[PDB]
Symmetry: C3
Subunit: 128 residues, 3 copies
Amino acid sequence: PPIQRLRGAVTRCEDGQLFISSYKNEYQTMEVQNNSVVIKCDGLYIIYLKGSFFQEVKIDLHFREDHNPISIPMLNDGRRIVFTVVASLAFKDKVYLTVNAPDTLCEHLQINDGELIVVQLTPGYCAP
Amino acid sequence: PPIQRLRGAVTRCEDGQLFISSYKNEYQTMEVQNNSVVIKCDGLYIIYLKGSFFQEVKIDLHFREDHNPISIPMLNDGRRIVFTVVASLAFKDKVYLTVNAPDTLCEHLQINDGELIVVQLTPGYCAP
Amino acid sequence: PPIQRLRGAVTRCEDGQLFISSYKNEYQTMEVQNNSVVIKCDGLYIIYLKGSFFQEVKIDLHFREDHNPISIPMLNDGRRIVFTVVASLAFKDKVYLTVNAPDTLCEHLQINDGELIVVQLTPGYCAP
Ligand SMILES: *[C@@H]1O[C@H](CO)[C@@H](O)[C@H](O)[C@H]1NC(C)=O
Ligand SMILES: *[C@@H]1O[C@H](CO)[C@@H](O)[C@H](O)[C@H]1NC(C)=O
Ligand SMILES: *[C@@H]1O[C@H](CO)[C@@H](O)[C@H](O)[C@H]1NC(C)=O
């Protein structure tokens, strides 16, 4: 298989989860299912989140069920996120984003130019 | 073509633009033209900027004409930048850095150990 | 040789140095020797450090003897580090971490879920 990557639009929040869309001008080699990026091949990956968020937000990055989610810091202006993680992912991992906030804040949250990039740095076993 | 990369020295500011030099101990596979890194091959790239800047600075990273430049945050000391972006670049994109400041501040700006690294993570079409 | 990578546990501090262990669920292609990651192949590498540190800490990242170490910033909570560097490494470079603090603070320092990831992005000469 090819180097695994996905660049998704992070479009909105509903019921405490950020929606992720594959609608970007990018050649995608991973699937999005139920607003999660589906890992098929093992490897070290970069996970990168960018966006202009119009509420001060507490977003959690979930990447593997056996580790705690990473709380994503905002930049000092309290309006932008530009955050990079490197992580060891495996087949069946789901990369997704949740919001720890009252649901009213979630449903109203505006995200400008939000994107999530997941990109494989090292090769590994791929599921059939 | 080889994996596309450039590690450039970010040397000074003139007329609101940071100068970028290919004078580093690095095997360069991209060109610098008029203080911009010239993209020849499509791909996801990391763009990384580091430096010790002796004025508190508002630097904008320009990477593609159809998206807004990214305002680069300083570290909390107000003296250093160590910043990582992942972006989707294409043939004809120019990666460059501008300074939003009075020109006197620009002309006097000292940058210690400034460097810009642009490195391809995924393969793509390369221009002839 | 394969793409060079190591994901190590950053376990504790002793005598001003953070200990690095290869005991992680990762296929390692670099060695740890005396709590340093031993570089065998030239390349641009990402160096990534994450951890929850229960003292506000001043950690220095050493990666090559001809450049100054990078002082690692904490996130704004004063409790976590999630930090990414891109650097040009060569055969004989040693990547290691030191703590600038009274030794009592070092010996007592608790690090939860500490890890250092060093991963090659571009190929280069490898030592025999
Ligand atoms: C989508 O995700 C949420 C997880 O909270 C769940 O409620 C819902 O049933 C999922 N739908 C499926 C299984 O596709
Ligand atoms: C270099 O860049 C600046 C862009 O502002 C421009 O003024 C100048 O004409 C350029 N020179 C060329 C075309 O190489
Ligand atoms: C381990 O590292 C420290 C460096 O400060 C040194 O004191 C010690 O002798 C080293 N041991 C060796 C050579 O493996």
